[PDB]
Each structure stands twice: as C-alpha cells, then as structure tokens.
Amino acid sequence: NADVVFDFQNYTAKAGDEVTVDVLVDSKNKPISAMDVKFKVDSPLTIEEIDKESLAFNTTVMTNMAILGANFKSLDDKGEPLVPKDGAAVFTLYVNVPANTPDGTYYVGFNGKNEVHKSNDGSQFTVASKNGAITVG
Amino acid sequence: SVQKFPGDANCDGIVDISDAVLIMQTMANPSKYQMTDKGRINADVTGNSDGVTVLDAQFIQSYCLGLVELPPVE
Ligand SMILES: [Ca+2]
Ligand SMILES: [Ca+2]
C-alpha cells in the first residue's frame, strides 16, 4: 500500500469553463522534504497554468509549463521536512475546457513522474493517486 | 584527483531534488546537516565557482525540470 496518496478530487464543468484543480495529499502525517512531478489531462482539456504556490507547504513551486512539470522543497526554517497542512492544496492547476468539448469524463493526473522525497539522501516514498474526474456536461 | 559529479550534493550517484534539499538544510542548520568535501564541490553548480548558496539548490530544481544543463566535469 502506498506511503502517500494524492487526491486530485472530482469536478463538474460545462464546455468553455475553467476548472481549478486543487491536488491534495494524505501522507498519514509523515513529513515530506520535496516533490518533483509532471501532470497531464485528457484531451481536449488543457492545463493552462500550474500555480507557483504550494499552500500545503507554504513554499514556491518551480514550474516548466512546456512539460507540465513542477517541483519544490518543503522544509521549515531550520531545514526540517514538513508535514503537509491538512486540507490544503499541494498543487493548484488551472484547466481549460474548450467550448466544443463533447460531453464526457476527462481525467487530470500525473504523467509518469510523481517523486515524493523523504529526506536529503535520495530516499523516496511510494506514491498512489486517486480521483481527478472532470465530468463535462 | 577524483572527478567531481556536478549536482550530486549528497553523493548518492544521481542528481535529483534531494540534492537541493541537502543544500538548503546545510544553510538552515549547519550544526545538524553537512555536506562532505566532495559533496560541497559537487553542489556548486552556478555562480562561477562562488561557493554554495540557495541559487545552487534552485539550479538543481531547474535541472530536474529540464531547463538547464549541469556544468562541466573536472
Ligand atoms: Ca544526489
Ligand atoms: Ca554557487
């Protein structure tokens, strides 16, 4: 069973809407030192922007929109890895639903990179994800 | 001489965001967190051999995102 589980949450939209996706995490109150991830969404939806703040960790997220990549370090003022703030977005994504999107369910999630680091030595947690359904009607 | 491995602050044989974490920690609490002599050499990746600062940690983050290249091995 995964050490930490991301909840992309579920959303409803109509064609033409922007959806704000708040990605939550449950680490079972374990601390996390850093994340380095990539995102995707089912076509024809697009991720238009990755927010540069992580509310769960009160830190700046570095992004590369060309690969939908994002990373950060999550340490307190003495360098200790942080427990994520319960209920707070770890990442926020802004998703565009084009005007001509057919009715359907379109998933947002990770795209083959989802690193969650434990410490300072390369050790990582195992990771799972759930939800991320954007139901367009 | 032993060839350096630019980016590999923690000397685990790969460059990834844990290297940025170690850099930050060594400045936040030097009593608790240190780099080895090799790690410190490895960690200075930008700034023209100015020493290790937060900009080195950020450069490793950029590298993990595909935005920059690490400096030459010596
Ligand atoms: Ca390393
Ligand atoms: Ca430097």
Residue numbers in the entry:
A (entry chain A): 5 to 141
B (entry chain B): 23 to 96
What does the paper say about this structure?
Cellulosomes are sophisticated multi-enzymatic nanomachines produced by anaerobes to effectively deconstruct plant structural carbohydrates. Cellulosome assembly involves the binding of enzyme-borne dockerins (Doc) to repeated cohesin (Coh) modules located in a non-catalytic scaffoldin. R. flavefaciens Docs have been organized into six groups based on primary structure homology. This classification was recently found to be functionally relevant, with the binding of group 1 Docs to the Cohs of scaffoldins ScaA and ScaB providing the major mechanism for cellulosome assembly in R. flavefaciens. The data revealed that group 1 Docs display a conserved mechanism of Coh recognition involving a single-binding mode.
The RfCohScaB3-Doc1a structure includes a single copy of the heterodimer in the asymmetric unit, as well as 323 water molecules, with RfDoc1a coordinating two calcium ions. The complex displays an elongated shape with overall dimensions of 40 × 35 × 66 Å and includes residues 5–141 of RfCohScaB3 and residues 23–96 of RfDoc1a from R. flavefaciens FD-1. The structure of RfCohScaB3, whether unbound or in complex with RfDoc1a, was essentially identical (rmsd ~0.37 Å). Thus, RfDoc1a establishes an extra hydrogen bond between Tyr-55 Oη (Phe-55 in RfDoc1b) and Oδ2 of RfCohScaB3 Glu-84. In addition, the side chains of Leu-87/Leu-95 of RfDoc1a/RfDoc1b occupy the hydrophobic pocket created by Gly-73/Gly-74, Ile-71/Ile-72 and the aliphatic portion of Met-66/Met-67 of RfCohScaB3/RfCohScaA Cohs. The closer proximity of the two protein partners at the C-terminus of helix-3 in RfCohScaB3-Doc1a protein complex allows the formation of two extra hydrogen bonds between RfDoc1a and RfCohScaB3 that are absent in RfCohScaA-Doc1b. The data revealed that alanine substitutions of RfDoc1a residues Ile-39 and Val-43 resulted in ~100-fold reduction in affinity of the Doc for the RfCohScaB3. Complete abolition of Coh recognition resulted from the substitution of these two non-polar residues simultaneously. Overall the data suggest that the residues that mostly influence RfCohScaB3-Doc1a interaction are Ile-39 and Val-43 at helix-1 of RfDoc1a and Ala-38 and Leu-79 located at the flat surface of RfCohScaB3 8-3-6-5 β-sheet. Inspection of the RfCohScaB3-Doc1a structure revealed that the symmetry-related residues to Ile-39 and Val-43 (amino acids that occupy the equivalent position to Ile-39 and Val-43 when the Doc has been rotated 180°) are, respectively, Val-76 and Gln-80. While the side chain of Val-76 and Ile-39 are compatible, the bulky polar side chain of Gln-80 would be incompatible with the hydrophobic pocket in the cognate Coh that interacts with Val-43.
